[PDB]
Amino acid sequence: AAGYDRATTGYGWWAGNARLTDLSGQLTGAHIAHAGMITFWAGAMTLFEVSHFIPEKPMYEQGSILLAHLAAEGFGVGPGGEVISTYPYFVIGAIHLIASAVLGFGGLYHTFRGPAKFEDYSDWWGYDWEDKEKMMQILGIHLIFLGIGALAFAAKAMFFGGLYDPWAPGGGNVRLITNPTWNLGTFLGYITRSPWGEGGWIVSVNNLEDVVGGHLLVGVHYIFGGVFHILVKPWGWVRRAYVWSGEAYLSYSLGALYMCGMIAVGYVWFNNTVYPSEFYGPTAAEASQAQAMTFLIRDQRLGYLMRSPSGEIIFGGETMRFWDFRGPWLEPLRGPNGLDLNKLRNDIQPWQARRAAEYMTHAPNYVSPRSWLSTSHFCLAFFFFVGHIWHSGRARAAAAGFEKGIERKTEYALSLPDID
Amino acid sequence: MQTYGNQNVEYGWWSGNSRFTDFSAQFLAAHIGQIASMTFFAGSITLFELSRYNPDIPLYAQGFVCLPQLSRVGFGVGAGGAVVDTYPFFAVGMIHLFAAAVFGSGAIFHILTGPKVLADSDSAASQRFHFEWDDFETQGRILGHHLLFLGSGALLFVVWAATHGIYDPNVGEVRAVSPGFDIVRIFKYGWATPGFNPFFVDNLEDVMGGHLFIALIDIAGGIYHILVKPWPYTERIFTKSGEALLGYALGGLGLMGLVAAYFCSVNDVVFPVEFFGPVLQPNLGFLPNFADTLDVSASGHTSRFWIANFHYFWGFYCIQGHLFHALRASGFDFRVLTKFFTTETVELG
Amino acid sequence: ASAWERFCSFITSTNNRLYIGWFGVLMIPTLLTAVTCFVIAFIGAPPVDIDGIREPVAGSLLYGNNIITGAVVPSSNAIGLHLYPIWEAASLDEWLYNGGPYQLIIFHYMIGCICYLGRQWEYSYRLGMRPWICVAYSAPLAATYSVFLIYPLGQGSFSDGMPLGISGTFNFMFVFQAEHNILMHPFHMFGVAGVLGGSLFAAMHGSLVSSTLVNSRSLHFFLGAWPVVCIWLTAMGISTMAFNLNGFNFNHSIVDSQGNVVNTWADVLNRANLGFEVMHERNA
Amino acid sequence: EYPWYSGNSRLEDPAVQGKWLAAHIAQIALIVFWVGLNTFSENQAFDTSLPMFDQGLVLIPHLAALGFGVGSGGVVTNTFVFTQIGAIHMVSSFVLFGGAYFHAKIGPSVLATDQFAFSWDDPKKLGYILGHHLVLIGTGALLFVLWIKFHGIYDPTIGEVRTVGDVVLKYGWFTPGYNCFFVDNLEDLASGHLFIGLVDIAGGIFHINVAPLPWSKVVNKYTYSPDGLLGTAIGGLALMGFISAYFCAVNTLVYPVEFFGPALEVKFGIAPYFKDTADLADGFYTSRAWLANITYYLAFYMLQGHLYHTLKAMGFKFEDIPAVIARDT
């Protein structure tokens, strides 16, 4: 073999993949194989969780996370967060396993059998990193695919079964969204909402109409942006404000992924709408408020609230930190200024009173799916931030030329005027 | 165009529409496209308003500019300004959209038909349409034909008001209107003698008589301009260039926009209250405004408010654009402004 | 020599006494704001209702405390994660009473820290050297973001954040131990190994070099890498504990054959945690 | 030369003409094939008890309008007729596939009988082709008229099927007793269909008989070309689609409320659409809504494609567009 050793590449075995920078075919094979890995994991974990599923216990008590994602989309669920049959989960897992098989075959084929460098075979598939137009077009194509995917999710929510809306009457129910939001004022109010406790940036969405409309809007934009990238050149200032190499593009992707990971943690930890509490269990706010309300129920049966800093009616104790929390089982007992005591006196329907205790027990011995997802993806996001810094610095230095060390005889610091 | 001194000027894309100032076919194409855009706006906005019409809400409270204008000119309005049948609005908008499609087709046709210049086209009859930015005879004939079209439009309005009727807020219901004709009262509205003020016309009969007069005047002027070459003094006064004619037209349009803006806020007859809303009042702080004269609490603004303010701004900035284009066409280059803070005189032709 | 170009050449210039750079453009105002507010609120600042119970807790020098016991009290429990800008406050005295200065300080300080990391990278670039000092600096950055930002986010309010004071730090440590048993979390064990081993390797390296000076490159690489990796791990451990994913628990593990329970050291540790916890939790 | 994704442009070559013909045959087969296939699935999923405008039945209501298993109204008594029609169409599909394959690889590569053989710039050839197709179309119209005379289609006002005056010259003026999009008389439908069939046959005779005239060769500046002819056809198709969508949305005599649901309201957001005005369950739409909206938007994109092909037919090239945006950076 040639080019698979340190001498012929300069990279130690522990940096072996670096050798793939300019071998287009094998690099593509590696990407395809890795995608196969991801989808294989998806299918295998789905099948595992189905094989260990137990219909009586809740998903969050049972300890399944890939199943809860499908349950949110409503595949084989019923009103009040009840499964009807675990068959569609098996269907999805099997499809993913088969797709993984195909992708792995393609990855092996390009890794070993197929052409090593597509530039030799053709020119549409032969690309060099420092070709700005080619990279623009590839980015555009993949953007178009993402847009089709987002529109597909919206189409499912509108025509094919819909989503499990947990704001349907009498507990959650699988619904088909028919009135998507499209007012641009709503979209701007969502974007320019404060990320702080003063609302929530995008994590504060609470109705499914906004979710479906947002996916519609983003899919349209992704398709349009992909077309734009295919059809135009990078502007001069754009050409002068970036670094054009493989590692630089990798660093940009890493930064984007770090941002997305943090936002996903925020979603899974603060959102009870697009992550229904019926499946992932109660959020920390929901758990605290349910505990407070259940204690209040018991104390009103045997014969505690307070004023907010703005003066509304809220619960008392530590739970005051969750004074603004909104929930499906708690929303009916609302009022113009906080939950009225009179409402709590005689408006507690049985299912809400059952949900309160059921959530009080399962406060995130027992670890909620929210805890697993939040911790894992916070750690992943942090490490991807570190990777973004590493690769961005390396890209900037390598483009400049001083990546492999300072030059002994032309050292730049030796020429600067002493500051003292 | 202007091209101070140096010809063959290079224009960026931001000012890229000045490139075809010399290509007669492309000029035609651009303007047919623009007229297509206007009529498309009319039809599409009519439908867009019909979609969200509420019979319960008063018409002016909701944001409309087209339903009041249609309801004013007959078209399915009952007694007391009631929108009885909402189908004629649909028909009007649909005809406008069809017309827009026709115009846009013609626009693309001319943008791609033949040569950029209409002189070279071998149609041998399209060459009857090639014009120049210097010859006042051809432009006089063009002006005559367009005036003919305007007069024919005013005539059509007179006929439609005579036969189909037209809304009359003073009467309170759609009603045929006799076309008046009193040159004395027309001129008394011209002078604005105390009895008759042009912006406070009270009888639709006077409006109809004035429209009859306008139609007659426009048709006569069109005939005259088609037949008669401009006199020499009009060559002495006006410069002969495209940007100069744009400047003249812009000044005229700015004046007309200001007049219409004042008309909307004040007259109650030709802009009935039930459709457009109560009259406005003109305020002048830093810049002129039209106050709604009504509590905007839980009612937004009347349609008359929007029309009047938008057209005040349209008129004002058409005046400013007229000044800009006249200054250029007369010969003044604005680059000299950069020499302001120096000792060099900020001045040329 | 466009005015904009002249400005850029001024800021991104290696002839200032302290490099500014574009990241330093954000670093300087935020750090100055944080330092000024910290000094002011540490010398004199009213008592803060830390528990959100109308009962205050003082932490300033002019209100009785000294350097060891003084602190800047975290924002009130009632505020939660709400930003509390001065202009969003009912009255200045009230705004102090709820603990706004803590929020001001920590937010400006965190922004300044991340911009300081960026500035480190930028100057490494401007001087022509491999740009990985910032990667090493990212570890203590992660630790501060853990105690000040991520832990309150997981806990729902900034009242659970770390106080800005010497004794406040210890109080935070003991409450954290009570509620999460951090000692028996493997990531903190990695962190302890990291700091102690880093000191060990520093002493060894210094002694060797200063004794003989009267792949060797991999030596310095390992020096740099070891404590940084361990601090990353322990910062991640704190962050995980911010989401109620607590450490190991071996209480009530060995049982007698008949059914009694025999104590182990873990039970003693749990009882100590119990004491710390019951002294916490004002009411229940 | 053309790439694979644009492979059908290769059929534009007169070098391989007959194969081009094959494609069209195949298309029609596919079309009629679907007419079978869809119906079968529909006949599987069609419950008799429920109103016919709830489940995804589009062709079943169309048959119901043409008699075919309806009595006193709201009556379904034999699903065998639908299966018969679907089977007829699907069997015809096999014949059309056979002809498509005969011309695709068995028949001559280029038609150059030769009477069928034509060229893109032979106005007499296209004139006679047009006449023959018009004759067939008018024949189908008259066949529908005969069906009205003998079998008779469902009527809502009469509540039952029934069999059957040219004031069409007034319907064309849309006089207030008109606006054909609101026809409600079977006699009007039958008389107008008789008229259109007669006029189509007359035009077909004329086009076979007489060549294109110079007066109308003046206006057809560029349509004597592949792209031009395709563009004009596409534009005609879009026009027809718009008219059919409006008919489906508004008209109730032809599209009975029983099988199609109530009339649609024309609404406009950024783009036009048709709303149900029916208290159907959330997430469900009447078959009328599906028909009107899908038809309309297909016609809209047919109009866009007509613009594309027409522009390409005249002197315009779209691949120049980025280059322009390159110069004016």
Ligand code: CL7
């Ligand atoms: C942690 C920070 C980090 C991130 C997140 C990151 N990189 Mg790198 N990275 C690359 C791709 C990459 C991609 C596509 C990518 C995003 O998907 C990332 N990276 C991301 C390649 C281009 C390039 C070559 C990489 C290469 O050739 O090989 C990779 C080397 C090794 C040993 C992989 C083995 C992983 C470690 C054993 C970690 C163990 C984690 C654990 C198993 C998780 C499960 C828990 C378990 C306990 C059960 C690269 C490098 C490199 C480094 C370094 C230091 C990094 N990185 C760092 C990162 C090179 O020297 C090096 C470099 O560039 O030298 C020139």
Ligand SMILES: CC1=C(/C=C/C(C)=C/C=C/C(C)=C/C=C/C=C(C)/C=C/C=C(C)/C=C/C2=C[C@H](C)[C@H](O)CC2(C)C)C(C)(C)C[C@@H](O)C1
């Ligand atoms: C003077 C001069 C120039 C200037 C030339 C200009 C710009 C002259 C300006 C000319 C103007 C402003 C003419 C305006 C004329 C207005 C007319 C003719 C109004 C007609 C309105 C009518 C007929 C109204 C009709 C009804 C309509 C309405 C219903 C009323 O209720 C009643 C009723 C019926 C009267 C230069 C600058 C170009 C060159 C200089 O050297 C010389």
Ligand SMILES: CC1=C(/C=C/C(C)=C/C=C/C(C)=C/C=C/C=C(C)/C=C/C=C(C)/C=C/C2=C[C@H](C)[C@H](O)CC2(C)C)C(C)(C)C[C@@H](O)C1
């Ligand atoms: C002139 C011109 C051109 C344009 C040419 C075009 C495109 C002209 C457009 C022609 C059109 C659109 C013609 C449309 C004709 C429509 C007809 C004839 C409709 C007939 C409908 C009938 C008879 C309906 C009958 C019933 C049917 C139905 C059952 C009703 O219940 C009852 C009843 C009786 C109404 C070009 C392209 C050549 C060049 C341009 O620049 C200029």
Ligand SMILES: CC1=C(/C=C/C(C)=C/C=C/C(C)=C/C=C/C=C(C)/C=C/C=C(C)/C=C/C2=C[C@H](C)[C@H](O)CC2(C)C)C(C)(C)C[C@@H](O)C1
């Ligand atoms: C073929 C080709 C190409 C061109 C390809 C293109 C541009 C293809 C264009 C495709 C389009 C845009 C197709 C459009 C399809 C339209 C559809 C599917 C209509 C959908 C309407 C639906 C589903 C109903 C929606 C409702 C449903 C419900 C009733 C509501 O109450 C109202 C209402 C009516 C909106 C390229 C670019 C790929 C390559 C070229 O070389 C060749």
Ligand SMILES: [Fe+2]
């Ligand atoms: Fe050293």
